Amino acid sequence: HAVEWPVVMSRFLSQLDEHMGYLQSAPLQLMSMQNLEFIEVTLLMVLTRIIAIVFFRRQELLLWQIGCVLLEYGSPKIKSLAISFLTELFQLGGLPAQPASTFFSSFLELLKHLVEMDTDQLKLYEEPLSKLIKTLFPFEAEAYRNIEPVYLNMLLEKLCVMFEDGVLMRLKSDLLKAALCHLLQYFLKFVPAGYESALQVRKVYVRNICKALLDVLGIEVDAEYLLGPLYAALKMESMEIIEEIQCQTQQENLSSNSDGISPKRRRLSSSLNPSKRAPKQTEEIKHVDMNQKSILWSALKQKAESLQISLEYSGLKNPVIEMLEGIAVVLQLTALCTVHCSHQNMNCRTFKDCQHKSKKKPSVVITWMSLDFYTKVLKSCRSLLESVQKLDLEATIDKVVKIYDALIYMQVNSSFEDHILEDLCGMLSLPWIYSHSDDGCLKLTTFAANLLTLSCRISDSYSPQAQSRCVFLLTLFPRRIFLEWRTAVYNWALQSSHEVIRASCVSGFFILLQQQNSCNRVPKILIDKVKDDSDIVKKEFASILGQLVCTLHGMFYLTSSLTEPFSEHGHVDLFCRNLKATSQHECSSSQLKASVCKPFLFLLKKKIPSPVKLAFIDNLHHLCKHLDFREDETDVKAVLGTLLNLMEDPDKDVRVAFSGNIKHILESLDSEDGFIKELFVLRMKEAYTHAQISRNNELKDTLILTTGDIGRAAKGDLVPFALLHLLHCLLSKSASVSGAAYTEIRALVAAKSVKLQSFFSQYKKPICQFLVESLHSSQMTALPNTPCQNADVRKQDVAHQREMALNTLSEIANVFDFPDLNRFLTRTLQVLLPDLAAKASPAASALIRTLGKQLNVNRREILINNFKYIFSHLVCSCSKDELERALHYLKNETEIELGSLLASSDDPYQGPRDIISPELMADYLQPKLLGILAFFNMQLLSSSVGIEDKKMALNSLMSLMKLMGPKHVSSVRVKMMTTLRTGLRFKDDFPELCFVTGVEDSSFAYGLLMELTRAYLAYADNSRAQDSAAYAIQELLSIYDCREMETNGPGHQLWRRFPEHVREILEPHLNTRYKSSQKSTDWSGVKKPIYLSKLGSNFAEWSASWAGYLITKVRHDLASKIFTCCSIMMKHDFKVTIYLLPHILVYVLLGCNQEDQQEVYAEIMAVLKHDDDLCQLSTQTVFSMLDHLTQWARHKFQALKAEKDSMVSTVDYEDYQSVTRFLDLIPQDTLAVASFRSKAYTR
């Protein structure tokens, strides 16, 4: 308001700073800026301030957006449309606001493209703008950006033209172009010799306007025909304009060269229309000679008027760009002889003192986009010019053209890259790598095929270049990040040596280091980090982890780089990367052994913490808490893999004590367990007696006193490294206590039982190559005994493998196991009766070719195993699994084995199908047998004869299991169970005639002791949980806490239903575990709500966990086992809790703080009432637990009166009082109405 030239222009800056802060005050500046734009519309004076207020127009160019009030913008927009209507003060504006008005009209039309909905008024303002713009085209004085924004609006008018469906007619801008189509000819032909030079220069851009429009639009058929009329009649006007250029060639030789450059820009305009398809270069090749008529200097110098009109036309660099346009028009004209000779005439000039480098870009596009020579020789003709360009000291001049030359290749396999890369990066390490940084970035776009075999200099250039990219250090981030797109085209072998050269560069980065290169090397580590999807690069990421160990080491910018590298490791972490953490941890442990080697300093108090702090960092970089021991399982094995001369022994004697209660004799047991002491030794000659002396330094080695089964487990761990490297070391492993080679086979059968422990090792973790080694161990097992006796459990252990990943190498290994089945069962194929079902089981999930060959190996065995009795016959049902390959012909050979090796027959066939239907070995086999039963039922009109008077049972048993195995479903078996019943009759009930609860009635008797069969409850329940697989580690480690809960001899060994799970229990019978900590953190009234107010998934189990937190003062014997279950059920299944939950309330309400029996009661009522899925599932639990109490009271009250030790039993009768008193808190309608609400109803 108080707006001087000194005041308002100074006020503009803080206003710009207010704009720089944010936008969107309470709309007051929208009143002010529209007044200020009106003040700018008032502005024609204050000449210093007129440009100084245009500094606000920079902010007004900055504050153009689509995030303002639709009123306050569009009000000022039409006010701008009035300001642009009588924009003579803008048409006579000085310099910057005149430039900013074109920014403002851009700021109009860009923000006009946003959505504020003043629909036709904007189009009325558009016609108000374009008539002002055609007047601005009429009032042509200097500019082109004012035309370009109008051309941006004309492109917007083209966007208005070709929006939905309109054929580029009745367009007022094209009518203004049609008004320009005479006004240009008015400025060309008649009465125009006074001021129409810049008007022609406008008409140049005006012709270029609709030309660039015709290049812009996504065009079509004859809807786009009048969009081709943007130039078609104008081509004759361009033919007039070329004749007018000849009239413009009749210049007075006085400073018209810029207009001639504008005429060249006019010439380039129709060339740019000709640069796209389409419309007749036979017209344009004439103008190409007129384009050639610009210079035509060195060869011809033809006339004197054709000399002086070329001398001033040559100035200064845009004429060489017009020669580069004369390349481009010749690149459009397809007159390659006229192109290359003019390119030779361009090669005749080719120096220009600055301007040839701009002229050489399209000259490098001349012979290339045409591909007028051999596409490998075309590189060298450019490279010979690039040799001159490297000789030119092309400080970004031709280096941009060299950056343009990269994608300009467009036909080269590998070797053209090998020559041309010498020219670029060798200059880049010298100077001017800023443009080469774009060129290296251009290479990531250009690398779609390069570096096939002779890449050992190509990547050696780039690894030198990325090292040289640290010399400016801004391209250091650019270089391999572009190659992060581009180094996918690589193997690992020569890349490792390149990575070794990169390590040599990293060593050079480590050598040439003060603090700057290391930061770039951190980025170069980071650029190597995002360069993933290669194991050698993951080993280079392990070298980057060794650099992260170095980032643990140098600690200045390196610890600053470390977590960022760990974030880069997290950026490399497309999973939880414990896989690569297997062996590479030992490399960092070797770096820790190097840190044990870097422990010569007398820091026995300090380095005992500091190397542990070094061990703390990478483990915290591995982002874990309990990994102090879980990583130590391999790290002590890496300390076992350490030679441990003197520096590692006392380190391990202190670090294990820092790890656990693991003194040098106590952790010698932890060095004996595991036998990776002996197993990961595997380096026979020197270190073994030194390690035994180190074991004498650890445990006073009595090495005969060692666990042979753990050594047999180490023999499994040996045969991992198949085979002779194991088998040589196996002998010394055998001859340690007593054993020998290929021996002992019965101990190898225990090692085959330990192969089931290796299958237990295959159960939880994967390390998938161990199964391939297990097949080699199976090949070694055929080398051991060729034991078909093992093949009962071994094939079952192979069965338990078979879908650990469905990794296709295991399919080859299962074929090898089938070859082992062809090996161990060669004399009999006796187990191949039931292994055919396993062969049916395995080849069910096959979807592979050699599995069909493994099925053809069974069809080989249809000869080779001497196809036989019902081993060969009764497998014919499930055998028909796919019939895709000539497996079908083997199935036809099996149909031969179903017929040639082979009513009441149907009643036998149904009875055959009956045991088949209730088999459900494979779900698909049951689904096949049901599908077999469907067409078997399509043999009806005899089944109705079997439906006589009362319907002749075993038609019943057929129906009986057709319901009984339709108990719930498998997914296709559900709809397969449809054709079970409904294909047959209703069978009214006409012959539908006729011990689960005896366990369930003894389950409350099992609830009584929690000792008798709670074992058979809990352990077998965790056995179902044992195939959580694995996810999480605690879900595995529950079982070891259940092994910590394991106790209680031979009756549990009598409970070995899955004796492999008892073997998995025996596997778990060693490993200590269970560090999952807990507390109360009570919030008990909230817990009374968070029985249901926590989010209902395992929240009742969490309420059970809070009940387990409440389960302190209850019968401490298995309360810890319940607390061991509290470790489990926190991660374990909802079902796993359910087998604890009754006994919990049996435990808790023995005696617990009678006012908090109310809290138990508080769980009950609140879960029912205020809620009503996840509720209703949780309800059934609450039912079920109360039902135990009843029966448990019945077990009590029987024994209360079956007594004639009755003293505490009277206290237990007092408990039986109090528990029944606890039942008298609920009863029962409360429960019953909720059951009516529930899943429903009978309870």
Binding site: L71, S75, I78, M117, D118
Partner: protein, 362 residues
């Protein structure tokens, strides 16, 4: 429940009070023309649906006259005539939407009066281009209350005949009486709208008045002057106003026939005969009242209308042959002369039309 939608009527008036506080802003209303453009944002968006919606401002309520009230706010001050053009895009769009609301189901009646308020407030060509729009979009097959809004279309054209040469009255001379033959018709307000249509006949001048009238319309108006007292009732001030408008409308041919006397007149004395007696049906009835002091003005109105009829008494006799009658209107003319000589003595008024009527009735 606290209150019904009468609270919304208490809110819509309060929204009209928000429009009145907007009308209590200031002088010249480019910002309200922008609010008329903000209305035109809504007004273009109504028929943009073209499916089961309406002009939502008119579809908001009925008594809420914000379309007039913002136009009343747009009557802040003249700057300059694009405010009288900016709502033109708001005008014809909702008018075509009201034309897209054809046959007037339940919401299209109130549109034309909003358009009439838009016609009366400010149109430079915002009525004339609307008249150019209504030339392309008009349907006149009207009904009872729709006869009033058709006269609101007749209210526009004379108001549009104002500027400098009236600028579209010759274009309005195209819009002639070809649909106006729907008199002997709807009720007293519609007869007052027919008197407004007669005020439109007291308009559309010598470009079309020498064509359209032809003295067979005034006789049809003499049938309407019979109809206004008889075809309905309760027109005590209304037919008095309808006569007072006809007192202007019969005197609308004053300088017209006294320029070159074209006038197309076939029955040039039938309408003057029964209406002058119908004057005595009220004015000699007011001379049967014969009061000196006015009641407040309703006595003063019809007496000034009788003083206007005194000019009409001087009118037909000065040119046409008086006392050439056949019926007892000549016997009522003596009763009109009884009404004259009463009111001539009771005039104390302009002596020119007094003494002329003293020789006209006598």
């Amino acid at each position: 429940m606290a209150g019904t939608s009468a609270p919304g009527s208490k809110r819509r008036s309060e929204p009209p009070a928000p429009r009145p506080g907007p009308p209590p802003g200031t002088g010249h209303p480019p910002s309200k023309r922008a609010r008329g453009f903000s209305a035109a944002a809504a007004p273009d968006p109504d028929d943009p649906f073209g499916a089961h919606g309406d002009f939502t401002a008119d579809d908001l309520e009925e008594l809420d006259t914000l379309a007039s009230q913002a136009l009343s706010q747009c009557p802040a001050a003249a700057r300059d005539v694009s405010s009288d053009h900016k709502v033109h895009r708001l005008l014809d769009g909702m008018s075509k939407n009201p034309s897209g609301k054809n046959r007037e189901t339940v919401p299209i009646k109130d549109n034309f009066e909003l358009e009439v308020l838009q016609a009366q407030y400010k149109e430079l060509k915002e009525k004339m281009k609307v008249m150019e729009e209504e030339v392309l979009i008009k349907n006149g097959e009207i009904k009872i209350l729709r006869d009033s809004l058709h006269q609101t279309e007749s209210v526009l054209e004379e108001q549009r005949r104002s500027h400098f040469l009236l600028e579209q009255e010759k274009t309005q001379a195209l819009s002639d009486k070809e649909k106006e033959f729907s008199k002997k018709l709807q009720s007293l307000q519609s007869e007052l709208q027919f008197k407004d249509a007669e005020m439109n006949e007291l308009r559309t001048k010598l470009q079309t008045s020498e064509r359209a009238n032809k003295l067979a319309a005034p006789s049809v108006s003499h049938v309407s002057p019979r109809k206004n007292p008889s075809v309905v009732i309760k027109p005590e001030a209304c037919s008095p106003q309808f006569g007072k408008t006809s007192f202007p409308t019969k005197e609308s041919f004053s300088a017209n026939m006294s320029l070159p006397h074209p006038c197309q007149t076939e029955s040039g004395y039938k309408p003057l005969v029964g209406r002058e007696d119908s004057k005595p049906h009220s004015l000699r009835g007011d001379s049967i009242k014969q009061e000196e002091a006015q009641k407040s003005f309703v006595d003063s109105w019809r007496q000034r209308s009788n003083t206007q009829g005194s000019i009409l008494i001087n009118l037909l006799l000065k040119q046409p042959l008086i006392p050439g009658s056949s019926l007892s209107l000549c016997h009522l003319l003596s009763s009109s002369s009884e009404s004259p000589a009463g009111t001539p003595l009771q005039p104390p008024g302009f002596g020119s039309t007094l003494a002329g009527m003293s020789g006209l009735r006598t």
